[PDB]
């Protein structure tokens, strides 16, 4: 694809504007956002997660207005913000109290918060913590995994192309790949690690590589991915599940010819 | 409504300063500023907190000066939390930190918001826990459903009444609020200690990419803000969130409109 | 009405200082330190000594008298002088754990420091509006439970040394439109005081018209506090512990009608 | 060398992608990326670490094309590769408090990369001198106790994988004029790791001159530590951890005499 | 002096390259980089440290080439050596927890460089004035209450090494015209090491006047102090640990009168 000028004129540009849950394993029709409580096994290759136990990374394929010249919609801009920081506040709902007498211990420990913004399906790479691990049926996980795969087997690539599918601790995006989307990612690890969350209508992040030129919607198509792990709670018995918050995602696109 | 030209002229600027005071539920006559202690439900589906235990956001609605088309437009804000030094207070019935020690400050989850807009801040619901009672003399997301505690787009509100709507059922639309400027952050976790800075050299700019401010509907300026700092321990162990009031200063233009 | 800035070999001043910092100096031995902390067993009852009182530090600079031109404070340099002291870990500290140092200064801190042309102007905040403050204390009279929030009836002038506390007042963000002030509070029992020092960092007193504060009757007003965090003894008892703040100043004269 | 000008053309630019993997000890056939336990000595004298628990520096030398012309290193893309890995607490790991979940990768970390047209220059500098440090690694000799703070005598260059400990080496300031060195290290007992990724980010790997690293004999040198923390065990045993880092270097071709 | 125009041509500029060692107190022939391990006194009365428990500023006097010209210091690139060697937790510490690795070097730090034409010039700030300070040690003299805030007869110069005590002297901001100084006390048992390491890092020396400091008599002198934390042994006894810090200084000719 040779890249070439943008369009002009009000028929020009356009938005795309949504919202992606969280999906960090719902164990029942109660616990939408939570995960099942953690469990953990007694020797490395007797880790088998439940699949309700397990964060999944969140995708959402959006159909933009049909363009076919080759006109594509490239993504210019983005504003984006977790939904929802202040639920966080409530330390009154079965909680673990911090001390005698005292209020319920607020979501806090190990976190991870990411988007991405492309014109196709964000590009997986695999990585795993303990290759000996047994992935639960219903998630797409890194397969033919060897001791290598601990920190690096170039064999474990995926799309991030399904909903509930992708468990966040096996896969991030690839480095090697992802021309076509922009991502954006941290991991705060740390049992006591506080949440830090910041909204505000007023940020802006520009999607325009070096060049010029944002993701281009390949099909008339924008995906949108996100994972934001916000931390633990935990409950009155010690018990500790996985909690997560939707994001928003507001993105101005533009019409560009390509060759 | 077409934005045109900002007018000139001594007339055509005008400021406003207040302070607003924080909602924290003011358990009794002599604690103004602090929530009833804090309570646990047994399990999630008994939470049932009472009013006087739950902070809410705070609103003013300014009148400015009558245009009876021109609006009046919001350029810019100077504002920071009065009275940090009060917590400073480590002598006033607090849990001791070990053995003769002093008593510990205010410390824990934290949620500081501000908003100016030219009309009320919009809201959308997102509940901790959906099956949670919210008590009555609040207002909080009806027909909540287990989609509540991640999105549940049935959940929109308006700003518009003070002790009313709580932090924790409720934060700014993104999807709306075109019209107002919101800044916040939710620091969370026991033991975060207040970080609170205070200066009169700080602006924030509130116009927009296109140069445009919020623009104030029936000459009236909403100002909103939630300054949760954090919790206070009695001797007891027992804990009640305290709040502190936040100081605005914004100044405005003419702009005409068609 | 500000008019031009006087240029010319006598158009410029400075002023140098230290203000040290007033803890509530228990006795003799204990300058830069408050009394021990003492809890009070209701909030009813709090009724804290002056000596564990921290204080607000205030300096009124005379400058050569230009007896219209006022000398207008222009830029400030700025430090915590004796930061390293807080490293004395062997003097009669609680021991961090069974064989340990001493436990060094630490948890809640307010550093803070304003330049003008006239006195600090003080709104006074309350954590607990019941809180009986000792007599040679200025602190807000009349107090309500509105005061626990907000009572505008608590204005004041940092005019004097050794007098306001710091826990009852704060900047009137109301007011001081002729003084530039900045201030931090971090609190919390464990936070680990942060202490940067420099002679190659300056602070602009201009507003955003370029005017800085001019000094009305060629008086300059500095104030401060550097409650650094507690010291805590062997006992656990704890202390507030202060330290001095350099000030350096460049003034311009200013022409005003 | 004098450095000229840039050649200009489609043919004048390469890029280099490529992965380091850490090398933290692998201590048996499951355990790639982890580290022996950690043990601890009973003296100074008795320091005597294992090979297998000692982290240590990575290093690839990638051929470029063959070229007086030079390859210039202009620009570089990096990032960790695997963070959320660390996301398993459910793997063997020591429960936070009871019934709950384990504990993630947390503690002393250190993360280094560099990019050089020769191999990274190292200054050795140790802990304790009277470390006797294992068969299999290249450390330094003829350690006295100057060795604890600075012993010139230490020089060396990364030049071999699985070979350099992290503990005992570090880049050598007063060298390393043509390779770009970039590290934190993070120390503590319970330091959460921070770990930021994104394909956004550049960072331009010219000096005040405008040159970049030259490689000569058309080789570059690339070199990583990303120890991230200690894993911890149901038995309270501790692993050091490490990821893989990505590289992606952009050269120009580049005339000297 | 009035300072004229900067001298060009290749003969105009010569570099400073140096390493300064830390002074940490060297309690004997095999703890080179640590105190000796940390007492506390039974009251503020009794304090009186040994020397080797307590830390000293470093400094070193550069001779220059020989030059009315002046050398003037333009830009610094330093950092401190052996970051990585606070990785080695296998040393003869104390185990973080049952079957854990060591603690890690970590407390309060003080990190210092500076950078001027003659000796740093320090003010005494003592954090107990009835403190003791031992023979060999140059100390704050006649000392009061105080000299616990501000005393302004402790003054000296940064003249001799392994003599002046971290806790007992800082910078003085009322002098130092013709020095640059930075530095950063970190405080509280339990903070972490942060230590960045690159070589692409420089610190530009000149004033707002764009004039560095001049060298008086051809001299430049560089001062230090890395005091990176405390290492807690296997009893829980502790010990500052320090490492050395590199310097290297651009300096060009400049005429004066």
């Not at 211990?105 to 988007?115: A, C, E, L, N, R």
Request: with cysteine; glycine share 8%.
């Amino acid at each position: 694809v040779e890249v070439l000028e943008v369009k002009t004129g009000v028929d020009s540009i356009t938005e795309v504007e949504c919202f992606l849950t969280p999906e960090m394993g719902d164990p029942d029709e109660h616990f939408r956002g939570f995960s099942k409580s953690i469990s953990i096994s007694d020797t490395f290759e007797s880790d088998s997660p439940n699949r309700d136990m397990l964060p999944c990374y969140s995708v959402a394929r959006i159909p933009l207005p049909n363009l076919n010249n080759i006109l594509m919609w490239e993504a210019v801009t983005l504003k984006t913000e977790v939904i929802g920081v202040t639920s966080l506040m409530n330390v009154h709902s079965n909680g673990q109290a911090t001390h005698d007498n005292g209020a319920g211990k607020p979501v806090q420990g190990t976190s991870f918060h990411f988007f991405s913004v492309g014109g196709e399906a964000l590009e997986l790479q695999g990585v795993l913590f303990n290759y000996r691990t047994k992935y639960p049926d219903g998630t797409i996980f890194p397969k033919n995994a060897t001791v290598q795969s601990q920190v690096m087997n170039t064999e474990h690539k995926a799309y991030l192309d399904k909903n509930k599918a992708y468990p966040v601790e096996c896969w991030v995006p690839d480095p090697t790949r992802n021309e076509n989307t922009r991502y954006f990612g941290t991991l705060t690890g740390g049992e006591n690690v506080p949440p830090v969350l910041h909204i505000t209508n007023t940020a802006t992040t520009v999607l325009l590589d070096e060049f010029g030129v944002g993701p281009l919607c390949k099909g008339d198509n924008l995906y949108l991915s996100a994972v934001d792990v916000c931390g633990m709670f935990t409950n009155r018995s010690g018990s500790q599940q996985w909690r997560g918050l939707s994001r928003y995602f507001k993105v101005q696109l533009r019409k560009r010819r390509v060759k």
